[PDB]
């Protein structure tokens, strides 16, 4: 209901407030066996892959007083990849996996109170 | 809903002359003419690159007309800009067709020779003896040609013989 949604938006906003790195991905053509494989290869509590609602992600972003990420979450497939402390190895790991995949897009993310572009994601690895 | 669906069209080459009961659409290909039946319960408005169909009342036929002619306008615009194509897979042991002038002839399995007249505005090409492509600017006419070519040999379910449509699957039976 509305109360559960209010609770949900509050906790995800808190999680993104206390976090340090974010990157957005799409859910196009990778298997659930592969999905379980990604969970085990990360194996770090700081790194977490999650399916988030597009609407809930923007509304939590408004509560996070950030800006510029809106272009990422428009007419797009949205993932959330939260990393605590160190995020470069998580980005390196996910980059190696998408290369092992068949096809994949890759949309701009958020880290260290700064935003990046698609090519800027290529060098963040 | 179809009635309240945008029909965004580029003004590059497509114009739409709205007379009382004669809609004219002109573009890259031939012109398509649509006849409006009298007392049509739906008024068009012509802004820049956007046509919006509105109705006067809440009648059943009013809603039915509002949807149907939006689709017809959509279909007319698409054919004028890029046309329509249908693909037929004529498959068999001695089945083959080819085009001479205005008549498409087929030799399916029949002692009597088979000829078929092509209507105006439709072009049918035969790249391979087992292949027929009907290209036109009016959807219903190319559909009528495709189905009337099919009527000579409807695809049977025991083997693949017949004038099949492309990417059309039939239920198979094993006639031991």
């Amino acid at each position: 209901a509305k109360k559960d949604k209010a609770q949900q938006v509050a906790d995800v906003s808190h999680l993104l407030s206390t976090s340090a790195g974010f990157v957005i991905f799409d859910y196009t053509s990778m298997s659930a066996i592969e999905a379980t494989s990604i969970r085990k290869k990360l194996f770090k509590n700081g790194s977490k892959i999650k399916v988030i609602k597009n609407n809930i992600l923007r509304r939590a972003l408004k509560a996070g007083k950030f800006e510029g990420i809106d272009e990422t979450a428009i007419k797009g497939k949205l993932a959330v990849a939260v990393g605590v402390n160190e995020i470069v190895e998580t980005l390196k790991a996910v980059d190696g996996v998408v290369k092992a995949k068949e096809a994949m897009n890759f949309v701009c993310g958020y880290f260290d109170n700064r935003a990046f572009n698609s090519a800027d994601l290529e060098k963040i690895a | 809903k179809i009635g309240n669906r945008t029909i965004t069209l580029d003004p590059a080459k497509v114009n739409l002359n709205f007379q009382k009961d004669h809609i004219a659409v002109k573009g890259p290909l031939g012109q398509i003419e649509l006849k409006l039946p009298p007392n049509l319960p739906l008024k068009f408005e012509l802004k820049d690159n956007n046509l919006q169909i509105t109705r006067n009342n809440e009648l059943k036929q009013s809603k039915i007309f509002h949807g149907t002619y939006n689709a017809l306008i959509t279909n007319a615009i698409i054919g004028v800009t890029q046309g329509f194509e249908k693909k037929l897979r004529l498959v068999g042991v001695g089945y083959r067709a080819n085009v001479e002038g205005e008549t498409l002839n087929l030799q399916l399995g029949y002692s009597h020779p088979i000829k078929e007249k092509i209507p105006k505005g439709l072009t049918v090409k035969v790249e391979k003896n087992t292949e027929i492509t009907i290209s036109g600017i009016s959807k219903e006419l190319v559909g009528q040609f495709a189905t009337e070519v099919r009527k000579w040999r409807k695809p049977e379910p025991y083997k693949g013989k017949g004038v099949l449509y492309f990417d059309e699957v039939i239920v198979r039976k094993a006639g031991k």
Binding site: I33, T36, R39, K40, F43 | -
Partner: protein, 128 residues
Amino acid sequence: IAKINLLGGQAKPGPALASVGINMGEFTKQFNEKTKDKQGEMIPCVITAYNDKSFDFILKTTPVSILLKQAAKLEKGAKNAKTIVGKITMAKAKEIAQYKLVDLNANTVEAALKMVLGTAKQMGIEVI
């Protein structure tokens, strides 16, 4: 991709592979080379059937609930779920879990623990 059943000690036959273009005779040595540590036991193999021809194969653990029967000291479980015959402690359950951790896709070891309970409920064996 084909999940094919081949005995660990006898894997040279099998005509189905030949339909895809796999080099059957060259690959027989690879099939037999890495299964000698588990001789006699039946070990299926997953085959990445594709046109690259460098078919990478992966072995697979024998199916579960046969070690449940061995640990319960009974050949066949009860034909009715309500009648409870076999009893299994946590030590026998955990040995199976660390054994079966290789084939399982669970992140943690307690998840593998409750797999033993899950299959034991199907066998009807009480978890004590």
